[model samples]
Target: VEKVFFVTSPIYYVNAAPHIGHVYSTLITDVIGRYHRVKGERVFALTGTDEHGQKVAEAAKQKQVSPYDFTTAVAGEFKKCFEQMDYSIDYFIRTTNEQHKAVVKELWTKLEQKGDIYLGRYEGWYSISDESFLTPQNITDGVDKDGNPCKVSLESGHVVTWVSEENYMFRLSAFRERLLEWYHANPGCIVPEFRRREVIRAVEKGLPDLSVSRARATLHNWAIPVPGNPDHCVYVWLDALTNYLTGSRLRVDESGKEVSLVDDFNELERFPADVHVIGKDILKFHAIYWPAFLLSAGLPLPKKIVAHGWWTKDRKKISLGNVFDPVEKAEEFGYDALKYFLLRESGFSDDGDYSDKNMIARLNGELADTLGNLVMRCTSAKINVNGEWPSPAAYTEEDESLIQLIKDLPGTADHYYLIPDIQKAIIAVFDVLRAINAYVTDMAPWKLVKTDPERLRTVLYITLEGVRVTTLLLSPILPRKSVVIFDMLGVPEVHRKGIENFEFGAVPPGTRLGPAVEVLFSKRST
Candidate 1:
């Protein structure tokens, strides 16, 4: 059977500007998507903004702007930023879109008929900042940094207030046993085993029927209306989470007309996502609430949900209000350099401390000196009189080891690649680069040029081929530099070559090589 992948970055809340955290999640998805595409999968990579909710209404009010106009502006900002980041995303859906609202309305009706939703009074502490409810036990009186009094959620530290309103509630408590069963049946369904354990423990304690809507009056007409009652609106969580299904290209319009962004129902059968890329803050919603919602609607469960951690600067929280400018960083160092630092320097599933020192070190050590300089050193010097792949008259262990190194890399790299371990895959690439660098020093092809010109040709050939395969692997992470490396090596359309094709003797002898190009990456000052 052929392989297909459906990956998503959670539609971001449009109440604020795009933060580093927002960029981080989407970048990871783009990196993974590019990797899978290169691995020859049918890829559906998605990202978008969540435009509805009381928070957005509040934000718009603060700005003295209409909610619709506010969301429109924020959504555009997200698109432009994603473009600036060069994300290879396929679909960008917005919750405010007519088709999305229509389907969310449809899905709400489906849940109601199935007895999974009911009208009730939700009386609890609600956090406007997080758009989440807090049980009595989780609420507490707190002081802000400037020492103002506030009732807050102990779980998230966002301000909450006692709220009492009639609304629709999802019968999430009913799925407790089924969710536990699902967890037991599928081990490691969530990435970073520790996170899964925490979620399971939360489920084991008990599941609560979630408050799924808000009174229309209270929300100021900012959300999708409940199917039968215009008195209330569909919960923002429900509205936003539906984007995963929207990504399947199936939706309904306001006139009760079914619409699709794609042609066939086969895409609908692939409804459950292959993976959900999200932040740690929304674990309960994706792992608990989302799966329960799907199960209630009688749909397939998503294969995996990967939650990455946050980024802090100098031990200070990187709030959405005040954020490190991602665009500025991209300009400071090149785009791919920042992209590499985000994944390579940071731990995959753990909170990371953002340090300029670390990023500069990675840029100078890995990008500039190690990988970049190696490509420059080898390709800058012309190899033999004739420009072509040279046949080895005799093979040394050094040659054999280097050949085995390049040949074995795709497999080794793919092992971590399939884990989708971006950090590990990057580390693995550098390991190979380090090995190739060592191989160059040991072989000393330049020294071999004097008396042993034939062996020198073989050494240079192996070295360039090593550059070829390494460039292929690095393309997913550092595409611009990879293209430069490919240009220097004269490999036409390097991306089309299967990683598996990077074996010993893959580049046949007598194949004419292109001239050495300019430096792949230049060193940057601190």
Candidate 2:
């Protein structure tokens, strides 16, 4: 059977420009997507803009513009950010897109007809930034990002204010038992196991019916009008979450034309997504509310929801108010260098702190010294005799051991990627490279050139071949740099297959080599 791997990052809110926080989630999604794609899966990776929300409307007012104009402009910035970061997304959905609104309407109607939605008075403190209602117990006096006094949602640290509106509500409380049952049945549906505890506990503690709409009079005409009643707008979270459905499968284009990048919309078998990547804050929405909404609509829940940690700048959260531009950082330090630091340095499930010192050290020590230096020496004309791939004529135990390591590498790296342990997959590739570097020092290939010419050829061959295979294993993570290494090693375009198709002996002996080029990464100055 053909494998289908669909994964998504949370649709970013258009209330602000794309920032480092946005880049972090998108980076994780892109890496995972590339991993599966290299494994020969039919992958549909999604990310885009969530343009409708009270926060969005308020931001437009602050900017002195129409809500549509404001959101359209902000969404464009997000698209540009993703592009510069090389987030290989299949679709960039804007919640404002007409087809998306249509699907939300259909789903809403289904839930309404099934008695999963009902009219209700939503009386609670609502956090504009968090986009969720909070009970009094969850609110506390706090300071804003600028340290101004405000009532903040304790969980998200976003400012909350008293708000009451007549709205439609999803019968989320009714699904509490079902939610707990599903989580119990599908252990690890939430990645990193530990992150699952809060979600599981929340469902077990019980759920209240979720408020699903806002009075149109309150939202200022910035959202899709609620179906049938035009007097209200669907809650932004409900609308935004459905983009996972609309961006995938068949749907109408903005031109009133039906369109799809993959299979048909109703191919129920194609869905129940393999993965849905999200930030930790949105776990409840994706894990609790999203699954319930899908169930009510007779849709399958996503198979996995991977919630990742936040990035802190010297232990402070990297937020818009306290700016961090990771895209510019990538350009400054080189894309692959930044990419490497993120996967290697960041904890998969726990919060990670990004500092200039940490990043520079990784670039200098790992990228420049370990991986890049190995690439430079192995492919250098000065180190390699006659600029050709020489077959190994004889082998020492050292040569045999290194060759065995290289041969075992493609499978090991594939295991990590297949298991979807991206951090370790990266570590596994570098682990083999680090071993080869050690082998080079121990083999003393340059000195052997004077003593045993044939032995030198064998050692050099192992080194070059090892570099070639390592490049393939690292391709999904260091995409641009991989192509550079492949070209430097004179790898034929046809033989540069996806990692799943990678072979131990893909590079043939006597293959002509190109001159060594610039190093893959050079240490950046403080």
Candidate 3:
């Protein structure tokens, strides 16, 4: 049987260029996708930009460009950044795509047919920045640009304004009990128990009917028009969440007509995503609103929503005053170094602090001192004479111990990856690397070369095998660097495909080794 996995990063808003936080979210998705691929599962990884909304339009006007042109430029930035960093996304969806618009319209008609949408008068506080309607409780006292006291969203601190309009409303309140039941039945549907609990409590408090459209005039006609109503445009969140389905469940036919898989294929073919990776700030939207819309449309809900924390600078969240551009950073400190640092330094579900000091420390200490050094030592011409893989003699207790840890690594790392504990999965790889480093020191292979050539071969063989296995495990996070090490070790392309392909003694003893590179990672100067 073939196993399939679908993972997604939230479609980022295009009001601004890509930032460190955006890169982090996409990296999480890519790492999970790569991990599943290594486990021999077919994977679909989706990421893209959310290009429509009031904030986007406002940003475009400020830049003195048409909204469509503005979105194109910003979306291009995201695409270029992801490409520069080599994120392995299968599809980059734009909500502005014609197929996406068709899907959103189809979804709207489905909900309307199901009687989950209706015309309603909405008079309340709306945040142009957040593109969300706020309840009285969600609003807070704050000062605006001119420092006058005003209303703002308690969650985002964005200014809010009183709006009175006629719009379409989704029956979100009707799904409160059903959503609660779904959460109860699938307690692990949301990652990090605390975020799940926060959602549950919000549902317990009660869900208000969601306003699902804005007056067309109010939005300056900058959205997907509501079906049969030129005066209204579909809400941004509603249109945005449908991208997941658009990426997986819909395809364009020969005539360029949009076709849905639900009509012709089984739901297991990839309708319900395995995971939706998002930031902590938008938990409620993904957890509450997305599922409700899917359920109302009679579609299966996504299996998991993993919400990760923010990246702060000097203990404060990255803001306009202290912006961090991931693309520039990736350029400064090689791509894999930055990727390894982010995955290794941050806990998956907690906040991570980013700084020049911390990044250089991880690069010099962990990458250079530990992993890179181990590869250099094992493959050096002095230690590995004749430039060929050494055949091992019978194993001793220490050899067996190190080999066992190497063999046990895939399963251990798999456990952590499933928990989506990226930091721990990475830690597991380093644990074995550290052990092998210690093994090399304790065994004294350099001295044994003259006194005991056979034993020296065995020691070097075991060390090389340990490096091979651990490097394979770390391949997904450090894709490029792993290839460099594998080439030096003379690992064949066949053995690098999946974890199941490689076992102990997979690399032949007579395989010729490639020339050792001078430095896998150089220590950064302070």
Reference-based TM-score, model 1: 0.93
Per-residue C-alpha lDDT of model 3 across residues 1-526, encoded as one tens digit per residue: 3536989999999998888888999999999999888777888788999988888988999999999999999989998888888988877888998878878999999999999999998899999887888989899999998999999999889999999999899999999999999999999899888899999999999998999999887887788999999989999999999898887765535543345434422444666788899999889899999999989989889889999988888677684698677777888999999999888888866789888999999999889999999998888887888787888888899899999998888889888888678899899999999999999999887788778989988999999988898888888899999999999988888888675654777888988888753689989898
lDDT of 2 by residue, 87-181 (tens): 77777888888788887888788899999989998888998888988889999999886988889888987889887788998999999888888
* Top of the candidates by lDDT: 3
> All candidates' lDDT scores?
0.81, 0.81, 0.87
Task: Write candidate 1's Cα lDDT for 339-367 as tens digits.
Answer: 99889976657787767777888899999
State the TM-score for model 3: 0.95
Candidate 2 has an lDDT of 0.81
Best-fitting candidate, scored by TM-score? 3
- What's model 3's lDDT at 438? 96
Which residue pairs in candidate 1 collide? none
